[PDB]
Symmetry: C5
Subunit: 365 residues, 5 copies
Amino acid sequence: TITYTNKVANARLGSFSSLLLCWRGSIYKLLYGEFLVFIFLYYSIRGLYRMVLSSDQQLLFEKLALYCDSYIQLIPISFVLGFYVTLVVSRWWSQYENLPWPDRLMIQVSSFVEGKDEEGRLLRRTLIRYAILGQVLILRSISTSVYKRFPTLHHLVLAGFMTHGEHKQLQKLGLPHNTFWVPWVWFANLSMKAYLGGRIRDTVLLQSLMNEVCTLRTQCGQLYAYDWISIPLVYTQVVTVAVYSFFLACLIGRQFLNPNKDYPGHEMDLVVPVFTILQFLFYMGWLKVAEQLINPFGEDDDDFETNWIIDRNLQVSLLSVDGMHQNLPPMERDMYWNEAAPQPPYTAASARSRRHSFMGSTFNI
Amino acid sequence: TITYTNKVANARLGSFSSLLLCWRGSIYKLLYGEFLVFIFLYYSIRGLYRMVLSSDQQLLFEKLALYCDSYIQLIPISFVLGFYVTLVVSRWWSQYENLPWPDRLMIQVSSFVEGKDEEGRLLRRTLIRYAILGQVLILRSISTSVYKRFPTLHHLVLAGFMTHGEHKQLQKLGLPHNTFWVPWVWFANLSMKAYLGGRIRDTVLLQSLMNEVCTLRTQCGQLYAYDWISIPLVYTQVVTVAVYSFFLACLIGRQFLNPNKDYPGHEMDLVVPVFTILQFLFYMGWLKVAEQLINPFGEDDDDFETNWIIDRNLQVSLLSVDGMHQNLPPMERDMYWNEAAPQPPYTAASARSRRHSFMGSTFNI
Amino acid sequence: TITYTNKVANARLGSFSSLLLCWRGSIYKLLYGEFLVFIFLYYSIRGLYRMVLSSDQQLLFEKLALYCDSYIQLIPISFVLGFYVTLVVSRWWSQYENLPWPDRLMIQVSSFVEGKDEEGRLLRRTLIRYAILGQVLILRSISTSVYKRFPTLHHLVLAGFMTHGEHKQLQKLGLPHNTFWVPWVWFANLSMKAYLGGRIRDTVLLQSLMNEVCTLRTQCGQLYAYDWISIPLVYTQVVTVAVYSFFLACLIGRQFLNPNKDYPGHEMDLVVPVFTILQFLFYMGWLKVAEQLINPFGEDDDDFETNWIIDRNLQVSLLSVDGMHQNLPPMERDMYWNEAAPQPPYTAASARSRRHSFMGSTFNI
Amino acid sequence: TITYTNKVANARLGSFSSLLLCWRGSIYKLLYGEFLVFIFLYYSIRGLYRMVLSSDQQLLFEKLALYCDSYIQLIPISFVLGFYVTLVVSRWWSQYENLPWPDRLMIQVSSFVEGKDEEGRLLRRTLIRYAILGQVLILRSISTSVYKRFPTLHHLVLAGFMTHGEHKQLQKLGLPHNTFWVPWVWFANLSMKAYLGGRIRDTVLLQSLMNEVCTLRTQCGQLYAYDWISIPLVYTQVVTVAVYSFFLACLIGRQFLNPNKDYPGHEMDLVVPVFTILQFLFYMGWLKVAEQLINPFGEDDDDFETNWIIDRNLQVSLLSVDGMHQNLPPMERDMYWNEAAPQPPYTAASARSRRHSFMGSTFNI
Amino acid sequence: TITYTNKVANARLGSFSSLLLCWRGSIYKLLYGEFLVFIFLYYSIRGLYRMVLSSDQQLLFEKLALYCDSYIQLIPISFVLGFYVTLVVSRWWSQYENLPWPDRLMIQVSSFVEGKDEEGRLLRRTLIRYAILGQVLILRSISTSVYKRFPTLHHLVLAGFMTHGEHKQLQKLGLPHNTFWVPWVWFANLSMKAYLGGRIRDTVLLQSLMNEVCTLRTQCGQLYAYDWISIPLVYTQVVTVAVYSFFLACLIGRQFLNPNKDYPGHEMDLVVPVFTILQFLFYMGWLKVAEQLINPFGEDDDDFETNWIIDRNLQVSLLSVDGMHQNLPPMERDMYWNEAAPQPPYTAASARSRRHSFMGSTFNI
Ligand SMILES: [Ca+2]
Ligand SMILES: [Ca+2]
Ligand SMILES: [Ca+2]
Ligand SMILES: [Ca+2]
Ligand SMILES: [Ca+2]
Ligand SMILES: [Cl-]
Ligand SMILES: [Cl-]
Ligand SMILES: [Cl-]
Ligand SMILES: [Cl-]
Ligand SMILES: [Cl-]
Ligand SMILES: [Cl-]
Ligand SMILES: [Cl-]
Ligand SMILES: [Cl-]
Ligand SMILES: [Cl-]
Ligand SMILES: [Cl-]
């Protein structure tokens, strides 16, 4: 992901205009393959119309240039690009709001399960490993950068995510469908077995534990649904055909005709169509937004990095559930043990923000 | 459903332009029946105006051609198409977010109910079959591909979804309304009977079980409401009349008049109206999006496949509640039993994504 | 409500164009009273300008016709109609998502309350009748077709919804406000009295029962709020004045002036303004959408039928809590008692939809 | 609030056009102070250009009239007015969805707390008074019509909302911030004290009681956040400057120039600019919608009446909690004690709505 | 934050027009750095074209001026500015709806934990300090005004937020990732230890306590996600390039050409382009809205003040859990002890709002 939040913290003169000189993640990196083709096609007609076509077949070219010029209209293209990109962006954000984070589950696992030895440590570690295997098994059929890292189910055994005893059991289900739901049942069975062992001392705690897994199930199912069902191909093709039809009329129609005929529109012969190049840039960088965000789990620059998340979620969870169970800092009296209104200090660099408390809009009347 | 997510993973040169050469699910498969009619109507006037109408009735045709040309405007049509398709798409996605998945219920059924013999197996199997019959009875009055598969309630008995003992009981209710709510009451009564049998050992578990059925009830009711209440016919007709009025003025008005009169707009006699055909394609593929997504439960290409779901939900649930109840893989020490920070390996093919952890935006100041 | 979902299941040639020949619920049924006025007003000027006004006062009419022609612009009208109808439709759907359905409460009432005789039957029946009276008392101050059916609170007694013992108690509150909240308190008091009688055997069940009534309270309050607070009259009037100002300039300004003066725009004298009639139809059918959906609880064609719902909810609930309490079909072994993978059959008519299970996007790489 | 729902129940000929003759809440009541200024400014130039400026300085005025006429465009103004009003309306509705209604709390207070004498009546009354004081203390810093009614915290004592014993305790906190959170802690402490007194007989009931106060806390905090943080002044100023710049060019540029020069656009000398007045009305009634709804808690006509709500919520709650605790109507057999399908009667006035139950879309195939 | 809600309470004549004379937070404070550059660039050509370029190179300038005039169109720019600002504003509000307020947790901490001495006071104070440390550790990596106030983790010790015993424990985790999740585990462990000490007397209360921390975890994670993932740089750059391309063609093309050639558009030589300056103001104040709200946690004027919140949340919580635990005002009979309908008085200043209760829309029929 491209991060530029610190560069746009304040609205100053050189804030947004300085983002036009960045290479990675910018339109200059995506439009390179198409600008060359457009320029070559444009200059392959200026070199035919001027030195190949004769005077007889040079007046039928001008009637085409003046006819393919009333069909360049900016209303419908700007409607479709703008009613499509909004939907693409809304889907893109919802695809991230459904990413499973095992932070609300490790808090309860580190507390409700009681034990600080063997058979109380292994239980917690397996209970927290199942919820991570569940997310790894789903972020492998939708993402590409994770598939190239775990090409086979035997590669999960070598990385520590799985076990040889679990691989042989997951191989023996006899179902042709995907198998990203088995760990969610293993977790429930292990938790019930733990409850019937004196570890969990109440049924309320067990129900609370199951309620936080029933939500990760939904979050993992929604990602699969989003990947399986995509935006209709009809809607995808309409925008592309509209944009290409618009830009095919600028090749013939926006060319600089011979001024010897004194046409109402053509009066100069500057070589470079600057305002055609700018229009191409502006109207293609709008389509490349959808082209980039139509599949957030890829290998682009503005795509989710779903390969450091599965390491952070492993390390943090394994630390929280194992090495931080009965470990708290010493309990001591605070600095404000006897003080009605604490007054934290302000540094010299930050003394403008010493504001007063808001007391209602109608206070000053 | 048409899936093309893997073809648009990255934003490259040949990514969106390569989707215009696909047959299934494209505008070329939907516009075939109307393009022929439009072309025939267009060419039936070029063949009358040129060789049937006389010179007297050839100058009243040109006043019609130049008069039916100021009524071709692209603003209101592009407003209605764009304020209608967005609503259609928003309804289409919500119709899928309400599909009942029995994955959050089988997890609790496989755990809370205790027994690994007869009278403890049949209980779980019937409890999980009722929730499937409930979804089958509703995905039969809204969908067509399921109705043609189960034309009669006697066909459900032969497929294993129902039983001869329950058919005779559902036939004896004496109510003229639909009967998609009976299994949701049978489930509750069976669960209460199971609780008063020593199977479920607490009331918290039973309440948790009922809470997950009270949600499937809402999800099944919302689909019926969506099917019963549709977008107003006034709104549906306005867009159609606008589009047809727009395209009826292109038959007479966009024709190539005789250049012998030197009209301000007509100066060439190219046979094929390429930029009229392109406009027809672009402005009809936008309407066909709504035409296709106005009823997601049909027999189109970009329509929900609600016939493999009812098989997957049966097999997965029946496997989960029967053959995986007290079945867990062996519990063993992990690969990182003594390791503060696990370091999973990276393959050679995926070594660019070894990124560093984000530590806040203001870290670098 | 007008239902046409089965007519638009598939996207075929004659799918949307066949909806323009329907009478009920169409623009032809709403625009009849105003098309006549528009036509009469239009033809009352063609009959004055041509045979009443003299040659002196026939050249000040044409300067008005050519001046009231640059004020016909389609952009602001299409903006307001399109930013208003979307809000109207969004409110219309939310008014239906708040309709109380007593299906999540009857499930718990038929199970938690224990008894299969007198004093255990009357309790359940009264508990389920209070929740129905609560919805009847609110769908009587917002809807008209229900008010005309129950004009007085004494009419509810004669229909079985109320009782003579409760009518005299609801008459004796001494509050000037509406009384649609009393049954929600009667239900709670009756449930607590039942709990302190050995009927409900736990407090978890009673809390679960009260949680499902605390939601119906919100759903009933939201409908009253929606009816009490409406879209601002300023916003309602702006659209009407814009549309009427647009259509008042088409009466004088779109008329066919005398071609003897050779004006730049008028060159023909066809009697019927076809493209003015079509514009009127298109731009008034858009306003009638908001005109119809601004109050869903009315007596139109595309309005909610809130008179069969209050019968279905009564019959279904009374059957569920009375004649289906301890009544379940016999428990027998399934057809798939010993079968790892069930294979339901496919009929001959539906054999194209035998699709294969989706196994992830990146499976084929 | 202005209520006109009953006048627009059905879509008839005289439905929306009859709303243009209403005084209160209409554009005619809001645009009066500005139409006079606009008319005076317009007619102060027609009276200078015609009888003050000489022939020399009457030909530099016409170049200004013809030059300040290509800057009157309706695209950007209609975009901003329409992308701003939608946000204003969305905020306006959310400001009402967060109004605290103490209807879900009194139901539980009237049931869970057990006692029908002194020390069981006072407890319930104080518990229900704290939740009302909490809402009164917040609907006094955001609203003006409530601040003018309770200008001082001593005025709450005289109205019965507060007590002299609570005023002295709320005066002795020593915090400069607002004090709208104290009753929410008093309620919790009183409920815990009641539980440790034999009144509430279980912890589940107490937790359910606290869960309904933790939601009113959020609802009261959201109103304060909405009042404290408003729409950015930049966004507010942009629309005003755009509208005023648009309307300043219509003073000089839409004037009726002397027709003695035969200009391409000016050919008549009608005194009143009817289509300029209509445009002013239409384009300023759109801005006044935002001007009115930018602060719903005011003293306008289309503003929330937050002064009858705080009386209804007091009377209803005090009646439900105190005088309706153990008070239920007699329990008797229903009219349909032995009847499988009840058949409520239909009156003669409402006999058209006897519709048949919907049985699915695909029923007729 | 800029607060002007009290100035726009009512819709009067001088309500919105009076907001154009405010300095702080206005467009005049943001456009100062760019207006000077634009004016200098504009006047550097009027001073070259008029007194530097010769008559030969003064006719190639006018063909550029007349050619750089058909590319000034307001449709696409007003589409992109308006489809971008809406998304920016929607993100800006959601960034505030996720701010953690410890008001729903202190209510339960002040009640469920039982004790009014030492070892019962320290427990509550530490339990409430952990939830504040959790929010301080996250509002330090996203905000700048808080980072400049706490540049180092040792500065938190000196302000009372942290302790020397917990600093040494947070220094000893051995993880390279951010450490904003440790207090949420410390809180859970301390609460479980308190429960196994006789302080919390039930498991329902402990589960309710943990449920309110599992929500603050999500609220704190969402802010970090919003800061880490920003709007795509492609979409950010497209708007800037469109606006700058629009405003670069107004420098040459909107200049006042020599009227000696009698051009169709240029006929006057007024020095100041008033309607170009106004367009610049209007089209740059729209971009500066996004420029300001693209990062709400900054040091602008319309930016969240996240430095008084962390003091209010500390003081209020510490007062609630320590000095207000078993402290309630005396319980006395109300003013309306025997009164069916209370009648609070109305002041003379507010007597217009004595409205009558709404009794349904169809009441008057
Ligand atoms: Ca991508
Ligand atoms: Ca379909
Ligand atoms: Ca209606
Ligand atoms: Ca107001
Ligand atoms: Ca900022
Ligand atoms: Cl799911
Ligand atoms: Cl160019
Ligand atoms: Cl429902
Ligand atoms: Cl053509
Ligand atoms: Cl409510
Ligand atoms: Cl016409
Ligand atoms: Cl809050
Ligand atoms: Cl005028
Ligand atoms: Cl999270
Ligand atoms: Cl200018």
